[PDB]
Design a protein around this ligand. Structure first.
Ligand code: CL
Ligand code: CU1
Ligand code: CU1
Length: 100
C-alpha cells in the first residue's frame, strides 16, 4: 500500500471528477459523498474498442463513448462502500467508494 484514491470536487452541490481512459482508467479509484449528485466525466483517449463503453453495473448504467469523446456519467450515490466501474468488456476496472 497505499492505494491512491481521488476525491471528487464538491461545488454547487455537485461533485465532479474527470477520468481518462488510456492504458487503464486514470484515476482508477475515486471517492464520492453519499447523497450528492455526481458527474463523472470520462474521456476516451484511445482508439481501442476495449474502451468503447462505460459500465456502472450497480447503477444500471451502460454508456457508449466514441474515440476522443467525453461522456458525463450522472447519478446520486446512495449506498455506502466500494463499488466497481469498468469498460463494457469488464477488462479494464476501477472503483468508486461512497462515504458519508
Ligand atoms: Cl479488448
Ligand atoms: Cu475494455
Ligand atoms: Cu476488452
Amino acid at each position: 500500500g497505499m492505494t491512491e484514491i481521488v476525491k471528487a470536487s464538491l461545488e454547487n452541490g455537485i461533485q465532479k471528477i474527470r477520468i481518462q481512459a488510456e492504458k487503464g482508467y486514470h484515476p482508477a479509484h475515486i471517492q464520492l459523498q453519499k447523497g450528492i449528485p455526481a458527474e463523472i466525466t470520462f474521456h476516451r483517449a484511445t482508439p481501442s474498442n476495449c474502451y468503447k463503453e462505460i459500465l456502472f453495473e450497480e447503477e444500471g448504467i451502460l454508456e457508449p463513448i466514441g474515440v476522443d469523446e467525453e461522456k458525463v456519467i450522472r447519478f446520486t450515490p446512495q449506498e455506502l462502500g466500494r463499488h466497481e466501474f469498468s469498460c463494457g468488456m469488464k477488462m479494464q476496472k476501477g472503483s468508486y467508494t461512497v462515504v458519508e
